[PDB]
């Protein structure tokens, strides 16, 4: 059982669930139908469990990439807008919501890293990456630095690498290319080279993590950081005089950061397929639907053009969206996890001297590719161990030289 | 014994081997050549060991699907009939015996599932699936259900899943796009959904199997069942007045049942290749040859067009042919082993509430691909270890 | 080590590093840039350890076959000899030094198996495989056999199996289609059928390894052997009147040896990529350059035309080049190892009578396309669980 004649929605408790419920109210008052919004724990964990017995929420709200696996398990119902409607959203957000060519979620809001500079010690920010070292001569010479951001994690380093032509997978004709990794090429190489050069030239540090990186900007210690929206509130506290903007060009190229997208999926097991659509198209994805949620907890930049323009009047929001256009969507496939991991150790070793640029990046391509094949066999092993006859664990691994065979046979 | 100079044939007990032994006789007149016929045991299991070391029969009769295995391993000789012999048989039986384009065996009998119904409870078969819920009440109102058959096995339940777009792997060119599985499409989805309803609406029981369903039908308890021509003999015995017909359409579409073709192949090792060809092409696949084998043990439909027409005079045989002319030829590849269990699972989850249709069905495809490539890599690794110690124990140790 | 404004070269201990060293002495004269030839142990093992931290020599000498792996690990630089200079080397050698479009090395020398025959027993060697049974029972009449060579290793047997149509992987674009394995076809089937026929008519023995074969020939027991230029020095010592010639044809088709190439590669981490190529293009890959190296030890046949034509005045060397020209350049890809032992097993079972040609030949294909991706999963385990954690 799910509902029937009523809507039950799921959204992460950290979001504007209060503001959303009031749209469910405007909706009960317009159609006479009850909207119950819920905020459970590990819902992104619980969902695939219950949705799979035919249960859970009618609608679900989450970052888009987690949906790849949902839509894969066949958990999301394919959605049905007219062309006239899709024209109301920045068209690239539509890219964030398709799988084997099928649209599977409504895209709510948009996340991306931007460039954050302390307006006090840097009134004008660098328009390109290549200025930053030479500018360090200035700032290091008043006992300050020019830039500091997390180096322990690829998500942060990736906008530079990708800039010159680097890329995860070839998204092309509404479809990803799982052989075409693009992390070995010309652009990724020069990208990671620059990044390592700075850590050799001593413009940066390789044990720079999150705690370490964030602090320094918050204490007017470095002029710039790279980070996304989720970070604002803490700079706000610090009292540090700040601004937010486009990412500096590298080799005349825009930096290409990874875009995450809040999305609204419809449970494939929902009786109320028609109502939910109705709620999302006609009530939520409206200026007052979004302005509503946004009031409870701000959304970053929004998907709806109309409301983006009204919201864009924040220089900080303006940047977030501008960068998010200049960026690449983040893939919702299985393969993505392996990539992350391989590129982590790529940059760890390259920046630690451990390995050269040209070699480590090539390793990530081949080292991360050998895992995608390994990950599906691991799922094949547990399915042949399952039955083969929400706790819940979980023998797990490891494998090696195990079986097994099959059964017997019928006949007569 | 590498055969040599004479013809030895393998084949199975459940077949008319004496009627074939009689074809070995007639042949022996005009060439003088002696055809022995052995009906050994698990000769789908002996043949790959005997013919590993150049031995076994010159020829083997078995179902086509097993031959892709033989054929793959390199065990069967590519055969060469001309244009003119080829048109003696339903061209569709030909794609049943191609491996990577090469014709590789001889087509004999054709096997498909059929609609089997009690003319006494029900005078008239439904051309349609949609109307089965309706029929059930008419019948259950007189202490009788409309339709019962094995729900546990995917091979029985496949035809409705297949009906509207479903397929194991895609065929395009005498070859099988193994990356083109289609149990996730809407067709499969629709068909599975429909069956699942029939179960939840108590028009059917999920614990229904071959035993129960064959029995219920044979005790005049359910107006209909789905079975193949193997079970015809029990229904005669039941003294139930049965008839057999084409399977019901779904969404206007014919049911798509898995086809099996009885097939004869030539040991890639056989010294007697020219011999065997003349025997089958000129003595067996003649109206009289099949007759003999059939008069011994019946064959169901046969690929030989002209004796096939004489057999359609039995209405039951006529519909086995109709059911199969519309069916999905059963694949002979490795990823078929895989595909069965994945579907066996999905269908059972879907029938039990365990999972939803879209889900249960959006797994097998992923599980089969992973289960197949798992099967192909683990047993090659096992064959690597097997012949590694078989070449070191008696060969490397032999020196002791 | 690691380098910086001077050159350092590695090349295996058993080669003309002295000639090579004395080219350094010439180069250093017109430049003032010191070259250093070192030949450390297991250098094909160590180089990928140290090229991987931005270290090792500036330039590396080893057979093209191991360079696949280096380039694939991003370890060597791309090389850009202009079109005029590629023209100086035999065109087909350039194929041995290309990896996914990229030119990754300079060919030097060429190696391949050849027919070595005893002149005293065999004034004139056969052009044909098929007449060897004739030849053998002509010879068994004087207690001598026609041919003995290494049957336990595919490298030696392949040239026959390949002769009528076999191939490892398909090549037709500086790229090796690895789903296209050609060990399952008519050519190779028959090519194996014949070899196996020889063995079961006693016209040849099943257990013939390398030594048995070297001995048999080196003590004039057998008229012919198949071997490469490495065997030569011992048939000098064995004092046998001997000839190195073209391999016999089969079903009218050139026998197809596997071709190996000594190649010179630049560390992608090398700070002197310019000099490196100036050295190689203007000092080493010149008559005098090779002449010198070739003097310390013979290179065999050489990838450079002009000086190749000088060495081809020696019939043995010329026959190496012609066999080389009719053979299969060796795949440098990873699926090549997987190729090897599978064909090693195919033969050993077909030749043992344990399996038919067709069964064994098809079984190798299952192993070739399975052990190749199993090695990819091997790297997915070790080089991940180790450096990953932990
Ligand atoms: Ca609840
Ligand atoms: Ca087994
Ligand atoms: Ca069955
Ligand atoms: Ca017998
Ligand atoms: Ca008749
Ligand atoms: Ca040194
Ligand atoms: Zn909560
Ligand atoms: Zn600097
Ligand atoms: Zn307003
Ligand atoms: Zn009903
Ligand atoms: Zn040494
Ligand atoms: Zn003979």
Swiss-Prot record, chain B:
Q: Does this entry carry the keyword Magnesium?
A: no
Q: Keywords assigned by UniProt?
A: Periplasm, Signal, Sugar transport, Transport
| Family annotation (CDD domains) | PBP2_MBP
Has the keyword Ion transport been applied to this entry? no
InterPro entries in alphabetical order: Maltose/Cyclodextrin-bd, SBP, SBP_1_CS
Cellular component annotations (GO), alphabetically ordered: ATP-binding cassette (ABC) transporter complex; ATP-binding cassette (ABC) transporter complex, substrate-binding subunit-containing; maltose transport complex; membrane; outer membrane-bounded periplasmic space; periplasmic space
* Segments crossing the lipid bilayer: none
Which top-level group of life is the source organism from?
A: Bacteria
First-listed, main subcellular location of the protein, grouped into a coarse class = periplasm
Q: Which GO terms describe its molecular function?
A: carbohydrate transmembrane transporter activity; maltose binding
Which locations, inside or outside the cell, does it occupy?
Answer: Periplasm
Q: What induces it?
A: Induced by maltose and the transcriptional regulator MalT. Permanently repressed by cold shock in a PNPase-dependent fashion.
GO BP terms: carbohydrate transport; cell chemotaxis; detection of maltose stimulus; DNA damage response; maltodextrin transmembrane transport; maltose transport
Recorded hits in Gene3D superfamilies, A to Z, give:
Periplasmic binding protein-like II
Spell out the family assignment given in the record's similarity comment.
Belongs to the bacterial solute-binding protein 1 family.
* Subunit text: The complex is composed of two ATP-binding proteins (MalK), two transmembrane proteins (MalG and MalF) and a solute-binding protein (MalE).
Physiological role:
Part of the ABC transporter complex MalEFGK involved in maltose/maltodextrin import. Binds maltose and higher maltodextrins such as maltotriose.
* The protein, known as: Maltose/maltodextrin-binding periplasmic protein
Gene that this sequence comes from: malE
């Amino acid at each position: 059982k799910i509902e029937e004649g009523k809507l039950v929605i799921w959204i992460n408790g950290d979001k504007g669930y209060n503001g959303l419920a009031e749209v469910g109210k405007k909706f009960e008052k317009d159609t006479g139908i009850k909207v119950t919004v819920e905020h459970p724990d590990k819902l992104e964990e619980k969902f695939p469990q219950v949705a799979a017995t035919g249960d859970g929420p009618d609608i679900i709200f989450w970052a888009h990439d987690r949906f790849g696996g949902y839509a894969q398990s066949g958990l999301l119902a394919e959605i049905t807008p007219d062309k006239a409607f899709q024209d109301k959203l920045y068209p690239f957000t539509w890219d964030a919501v398709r799988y084997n060519g099928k649209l599977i979620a409504y895209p709510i809001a948009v996340e991306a890293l931007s460039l954050i500079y302390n307006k006090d010690l840097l009134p004008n920010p660098p328009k390109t990456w290549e200025e930053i070292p030479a500018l360090d001569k200035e700032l290091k010479a008043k006992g300050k630095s020019a830039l500091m951001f997390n180096l322990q994690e690829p998500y942060f380093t990736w906008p530079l690498i990708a800039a010159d032509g680097g890329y995860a997978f070839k998204y092309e004709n509404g479809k990803y290319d799982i052989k075409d990794v693009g992390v070995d090429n010309a652009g990724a190489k020069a990208g990671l080279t620059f990044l390592v050069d700075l850590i050799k030239n001593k413009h940066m540090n390789a044990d720079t993590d999150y705690s370490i990186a964030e602090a320094a900007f918050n204490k007017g210690e470095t002029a710039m950081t790279i980070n996304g929206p989720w970070a604002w509130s803490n700079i706000d506290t610090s009292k540090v005089n700040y601004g937010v903007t486009v990412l500096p060009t590298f080799k005349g190229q825009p930096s290409k950061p990874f875009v995450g997208v809040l999305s609204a999926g419809i449970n494939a097991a929902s009786p109320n397929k028609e109502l939910a659509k109705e709620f999302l198209e006609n009530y939520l994805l409206t200026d007052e639907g979004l302005e509503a949620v946004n009031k409870d907890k701000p959304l970053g930049a929004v998907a709806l053009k109309s409301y983006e323009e009204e919201l864009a009047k924040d220089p900080r929001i303006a940047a977030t969206m501008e960068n998010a256009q200049k960026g690449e969507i983040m893939p919702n496939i299985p393969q993505m996890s392996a990539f992350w991991y391989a590129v982590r150790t790529a940059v760890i070793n390259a920046a630690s001297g451990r390995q050269t640029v040209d070699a480590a990046l090539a390793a990530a391509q081949t080292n991360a590719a050998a895992m995608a094949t390994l990950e599906k066999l691991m799922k094949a092993f547990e399915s042949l161990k399952s039955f083969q006859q929400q706790q819940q664990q979980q023998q797990q691994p490891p494998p090696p030289p195990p079986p097994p065979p099959p059964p017997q046979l019928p006949q007569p």
